[PDB]
């Protein structure tokens, strides 16, 4: 249960690409960009849409649905770039696909960083 809350973890753990919930992240971790795992950096806007990953939590042995909502409308954060691809699939499975910009439907589609939001059990 403690491993389900990134805010209680060591910052060096959550800012790493191998942190369990970052398993299908292609972009910059918002937690390194002035935000947190679940909050956009100041002045960047959440995407209403996202791709979704299924990630294993090795701390509790369960598998979880993770929504990779972007933060948008600022230029590239440039920090903590990750490119993990667990259970990622091509564009013919569009909401499992991370080689597209999930800021695409925002008022400003410039990609700033990516968050890893816990939806629930897979």
């Amino acid at each position: 249960h403690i491993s389900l809350n990134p805010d209680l973890a060591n910052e060096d753990e959550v800012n790493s690409c191998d942190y369990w919930r970052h398993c299908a992240v292609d972009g910059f971790l918002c937690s390194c960009c002035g935000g947190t795992t679940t909050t956009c950096p100041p002045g960047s806007t959440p995407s209403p849409i996202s791709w979704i990953g299924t990630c294993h939590n090795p701390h509790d042995g369960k598998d979880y649905l993770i929504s990779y909502h972007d933060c948008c409308g600022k230029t590239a954060c440039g920090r903590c770039q990750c490119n993990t691809q667990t259970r990622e699939r091509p564009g013919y499975e569009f909401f499992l696909h991370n080689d597209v910009n999930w800021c695409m439907a925002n008022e400003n589609s410039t990609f700033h960083c990516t968050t890893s939001v816990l939806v629930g059990l897979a």
Binding site: G73, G91, E93, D99
Partner: protein, 356 residues
């Protein structure tokens, strides 16, 4: 010799196009133009946020696709195709698109053209998917193919003037045949080629004149034949022998395959120790498959390549690791490395030859 107004110094037949996403500063993407024979930088075309690029079939123009906003990070959005002179590397014409052109990594299939060169065919996502048709001559967006919802990417048919296919979520292919005006005249859907859940394919085709081959996450090969009126599908056959399987060799990359049409050799980026999540790993090796005999005829070091492209007439393969471009002679089954162009890009997953 005047100060400005110059054309590219090397002949068209020497030119290649490295699409640099510049992902760290994605609003300043650009196309770098190189001479593959000596590695000389010849010029560039700016492409704003996440540009895509192709060269017109006739070799006379460069087409780009991009997104602008009035104040970049705020203000009104303009999605466009731009037409540039291939020799002068100068802007000519903007063509307005609806504000849903695909923003994504530079797979060849997101931005293509018909065999006859008369239409640009591009992928949209709003995030609902459709395929857009642009009439080059008229400089107009003319048709939104919403029939392609649930599908992804454009595979032109080199045996027809204005037909293409797309890969759909049912594991099949949708063919679209355009009329003279660019509106959809007819369409057809194949039977299931591959299992989406059990053996997903990479989208990149190894494309012949009337057939296309595709490789899968687990090292299988599927084909689509479009010599007939309707597409016929088959597969799988495996890229892997027993030794390969025991070492868990699988494909990995982006534009990860190619076909040398005269010989039927297919080129594929491969890596060992494949498991869930390794489908975009750089190449440990390039494998060369005879698609008729279904046997591997060569394996060579991959130089960490992610994308490739083939030139038929000069028997050439280019590979690209994100920043460096490798040039191979593929006239014989075993490729020979001719040279490496270091620092051709900061973050490129696509290279293309000028058509000859």
């Amino acid at each position: 010799v005047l100060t400005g107004g110059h054309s590219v110094s090397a002949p068209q037949e020497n030119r290649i196009y490295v699409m640099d996403s510049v992902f760290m500063h994605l609003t300043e993407s650009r196309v770098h133009v190189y001479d593959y024979t000596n590695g000389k930088f010849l010029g560039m075309v700016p492409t704003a946020f996440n540009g895509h690029v192709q060269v017109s079939n006739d070799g006379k123009k460069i087409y780009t696709m991009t997104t602008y906003h009035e104040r970049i990070t705020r203000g009104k959005r303009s999605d466009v195709v731009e037409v540039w002179d291939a020799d002068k590397l100068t802007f000519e014409k903007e063509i307005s698109l609806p504000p849903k052109r695909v923003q994504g990594l530079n797979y060849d299939g997101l931005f293509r053209q018909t065999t006859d060169g008369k239409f640009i065919v591009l992928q949209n996502a709003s995030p609902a998917t459709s395929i857009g048709i642009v009439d080059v001559a008229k400089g107009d967006y003319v048709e939104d193919v919403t029939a392609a919802a649930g599908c992804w990417s454009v595979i032109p048919q080199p045996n027809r003037p204005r037909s293409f296919m797309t890969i759909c979520g049912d594991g099949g292919l949708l063919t679209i045949n355009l009329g003279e005006d660019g509106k959809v005249a007819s369409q057809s859907r194949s039977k299931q080629m591959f299992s989406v859940k059990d053996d997903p394919i990479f989208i990149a085709p190894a494309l012949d004149k009337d057939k296309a081959h595709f490789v899968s996450y687990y090292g299988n090969v599927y084909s689509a034949d479009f010599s007939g009126d309707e597409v016929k599908v088959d597969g799988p056959w495996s890229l892997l022998n027993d030794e390969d399987k025991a070492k868990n060799w699988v494909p990995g990359g982006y534009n990860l395959v190619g076909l040398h049409r005269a010989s039927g050799r297919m080129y594929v980026f491969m890596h060992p120790d494949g498991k869930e999540g390794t489908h975009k790993f750089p190449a440990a090796e390039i494998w060369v498959m005879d698609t008729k005999t279904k046997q591997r005829v060569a394996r060579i070091p991959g130089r960490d390549a992610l994308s490739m492209t083939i030139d038929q007439q000069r028997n050439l393969m280019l590979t690209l690791d994100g920043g460096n471009v490798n040039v191979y002679d593929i006239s014989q089954p075993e490729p020979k490395l001719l040279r490496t162009i270091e620092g051709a890009a900061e973050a490129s997953l696509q290279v293309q030859f000028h058509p000859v």
